[PDB]
Symmetry: C3
Subunit: 317 residues, 3 copies
Amino acid sequence: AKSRTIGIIGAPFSKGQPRGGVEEGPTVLRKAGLLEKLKEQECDVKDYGDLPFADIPNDSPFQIVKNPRSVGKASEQLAGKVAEVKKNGRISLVLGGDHSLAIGSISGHARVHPDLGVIWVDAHTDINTPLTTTSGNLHGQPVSFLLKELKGKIPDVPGFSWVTPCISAKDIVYIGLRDVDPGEHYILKTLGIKYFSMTEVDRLGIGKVMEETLSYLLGRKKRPIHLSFDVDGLDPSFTPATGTPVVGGLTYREGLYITEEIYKTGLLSGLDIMEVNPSLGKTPEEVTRTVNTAVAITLACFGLAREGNHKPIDYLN
Amino acid sequence: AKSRTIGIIGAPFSKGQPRGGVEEGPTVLRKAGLLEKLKEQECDVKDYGDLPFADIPNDSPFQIVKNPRSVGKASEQLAGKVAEVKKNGRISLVLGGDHSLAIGSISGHARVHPDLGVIWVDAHTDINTPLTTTSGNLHGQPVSFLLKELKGKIPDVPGFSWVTPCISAKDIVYIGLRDVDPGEHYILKTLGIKYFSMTEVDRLGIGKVMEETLSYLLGRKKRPIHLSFDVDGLDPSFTPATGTPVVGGLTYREGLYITEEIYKTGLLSGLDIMEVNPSLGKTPEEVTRTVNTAVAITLACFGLAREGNHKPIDYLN
Amino acid sequence: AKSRTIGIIGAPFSKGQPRGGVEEGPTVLRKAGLLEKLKEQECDVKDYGDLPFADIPNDSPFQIVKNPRSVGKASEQLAGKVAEVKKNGRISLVLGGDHSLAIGSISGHARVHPDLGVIWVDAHTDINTPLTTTSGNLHGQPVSFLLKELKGKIPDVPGFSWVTPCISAKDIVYIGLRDVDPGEHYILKTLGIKYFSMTEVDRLGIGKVMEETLSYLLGRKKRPIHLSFDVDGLDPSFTPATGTPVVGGLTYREGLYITEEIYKTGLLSGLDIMEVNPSLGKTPEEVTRTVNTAVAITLACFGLAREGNHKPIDYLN
Ligand SMILES: O=C(O)C1(CN2C[C@H](CN3CCC(CCS(=O)(=O)c4ccc(F)cc4)CC3)[C@@H](c3cccc(F)c3)C2)CCCC1
Ligand SMILES: O=C(O)C1(CN2C[C@H](CN3CCC(CCS(=O)(=O)c4ccc(F)cc4)CC3)[C@@H](c3cccc(F)c3)C2)CCCC1
Ligand SMILES: O=C(O)C1(CN2C[C@H](CN3CCC(CCS(=O)(=O)c4ccc(F)cc4)CC3)[C@@H](c3cccc(F)c3)C2)CCCC1
Ligand SMILES: [Mn+2]
Ligand SMILES: [Mn+2]
Ligand SMILES: [Mn+2]
Ligand SMILES: [Mn+2]
Ligand SMILES: [Mn+2]
Ligand SMILES: [Mn+2]
């Protein structure tokens, strides 16, 4: 099946944020048995390995924006890799690494399918511009670089001249929001982006959130879907080993519902599994808990259903 | 009152599964004061005691199916006892013991009430046949022995000759499914059984789940309800002292919501409280958490309401 | 804005209940940065300080009712301070303290705004009379002293002659009930008070619960809202440092949802944050979790939103 044909890209990159260890995300996700578990689920899985992100020593800040040439290059190289996987007729599965890699993931995916819709699962909007940012971390800015409506608001940042905005504000849905910067909230409301913060999930229930998200993106016409999943989207009781955890997040069941509903569309075309940082567990079990939840979210993206699964064979004879 | 008139049956049996200690379930539920608490809730309680299960020597497996004669005999004795309690106009309350016992519990109940409707609360379907099973554990096959649609599809297993299928595929509703084998999923779809897996619970909310469940079974006219409750139906954060725990289960709130709604119909006729394993707590608190939850569940089946309860007197006088 | 104009009142009182330490509630809430966080959120914060509760020796019990004179005087003092805060055009914010103080807080609020409607967030109804109580603790009786319908059912208790019932049975909505005494349940049902016990919250979801509460209180016409928040309304996994924790409570997310919806009406006029007991946390982390949750609850009442907030300036300019 097209929805079960995968191209794995490891992107061990941490310089979009300050905490070391997120670069081990591809390693810990593979060691958890992701490839084997995917193959046991009737998936055709090709592993493109981990991208080498050669050191860029001498990468001074652009204003408060840290490591820009390193972040820019990593995303530029990932865009080329994602485009190759997309050309090979596979669902690009990016194992991060920090969320700044979404710049490259979505840009690369958009080169092959320019009509893609984005579902962004995260505690954060990640829509700061290099000028609205207060943390100066590029993993909090990927969405600003990608939006057509923000053209003329993105300054000339070293390492990013290759970027052209590919998604319109109307082609993205956020799910999970609970830690939005003032500057980010201004952008979000002014651009009229469709979002379901934790308030909307509490109000509507995840059932209605998915119904509305999939109608908003696919109601006009069936188009490819890019799911960009930041593990901090789930509550820290499920994915504690992450850089910026925020209280009162999506439950384990809610994360599974999102991905089960996205799978069922048969339109998943690109997936990012980001922000798993195995050096940030408070204990060894918090790390295994984080990686297992990330694996479980991923398997549901490729067909694993809680109601059960069977092959097209007669089990009674 | 009929809905508060009970016959307690201890069923200290474990040989339907490989983990020892589930036979101690009737002991710890009794120790927690289940009987006294029910009597304090205006219930008429008659205790039929704990069934003696004789150790069957040379109980050789049937193909990969472990302990067949032991599981078949325990269910045979339990069917006779449930039928006796049912004949005395009481709600049979089986304290397990592993879920293979539901063969005896439901068969016995159907001998007095053949028009009964089953509600199965569990992470599992337990509908494997001796031929579709992969674990070979009989606590994962009771539904197959009971279904009229699977007559001719169940082999002649030693100890099960007394079994007569007593329920149709249309007479059962599952709630809480999240760990269903491919053969079980195939049976579940091909027979068109009604189920609310964790996916349906997330989509609908337990309110709509219970509305639809009760309308599906009762819509035609009032009929007896058999609730077969496996504590692993609830999330391991509420019932960790169980043999087969599965992540992402029904919350403590949802478990209470199911049972409070069933009580309200006034049609509860048979109840199974299964799979409590006090030797499977990682800490003594995990055992008490499990036992207290299983008691709360049972109390709600017989009238205990979170909004409160009052004796029919004037409290303001 | 008026919905962001606050009058802080500390109420270090514990004699409404038998567990020491709840008088330290205004201290830890202050130490947590409450005032500073409200100011950061564009709030006009005036601190009216901590009320002085003078010791009353030889305060013999009325029948089984403990410390009556102490409770009576504390509420009497609070009523005058809340009435003063209300006349100065500010939302009253009472930092508790045990819930008996609600007598004082609501009576004082009603002196300036008689048409007020109450939303009572708690696991308990706190509607026992001095005659129906079984514990003898006045923190479980505030609602009965405030109700016009129970006028004639409240005996003459030492310290309470100043009390005039200011609310009808129709002007109050309960949210979170799950430990109601038989006497309270009789009161709740006979007076026909509107309530959302955990059962109703499970049935409908917090979204519908809030739509239902507000339509019931504000339907007829716009009126001032008094939110009396007992931290034990939320589950003990979120607010463990409380005197009367009850399992299966409101989630952290439901807590925030209730308060975000109350803020949006723009009609909040009185608030009580009660039963924070920093001496009851099993660990230092259990105290900080209860405190941080209580602080988060308070900020949402004054406009802190999970989708984000921004100032009326152009962030892109
Ligand atoms: O642009 C970005 O970088 C992002 C947006 N961030 C938001 C952050 C503000 N935000 C306030 C609330 C805080 C409390 C969260 S909590 O859930 O109460 C908690 C507390 C302690 C704990 F151990 C665990 C959890 C968490 C931090 C803010 C920032 C962070 C750091 C320097 C700074 F000047 C500005 C910008 C997008 C990409 C990542 C972050
Ligand atoms: O028929 C049966 O026996 C039943 C059905 N199936 C289920 C089981 C497959 N099933 C996958 C998911 C596993 C749980 C994953 S987890 O939730 O992440 C987890 C992990 C570790 C932990 F400590 C706690 C929780 C539990 C195992 C399958 C089986 C079990 C054993 C031998 C075997 F060859 C085949 C049988 C019906 C009655 C009971 C079981
Ligand atoms: O009026 C009042 O004072 C209030 C009403 N209370 C109710 C209390 C009965 N109530 C039953 C359910 C119990 C089980 C709760 S549990 O979640 O299972 C639990 C168990 C153990 C644990 F460590 C923590 C939590 C907790 C106690 C009852 C009482 C308390 C004390 C003497 C007495 F004779 C009668 C009156 C209103 C204001 C506060 C209390
Ligand atoms: Mn994030
Ligand atoms: Mn992110
Ligand atoms: Mn079972
Ligand atoms: Mn089970
Ligand atoms: Mn209270
Ligand atoms: Mn309370």
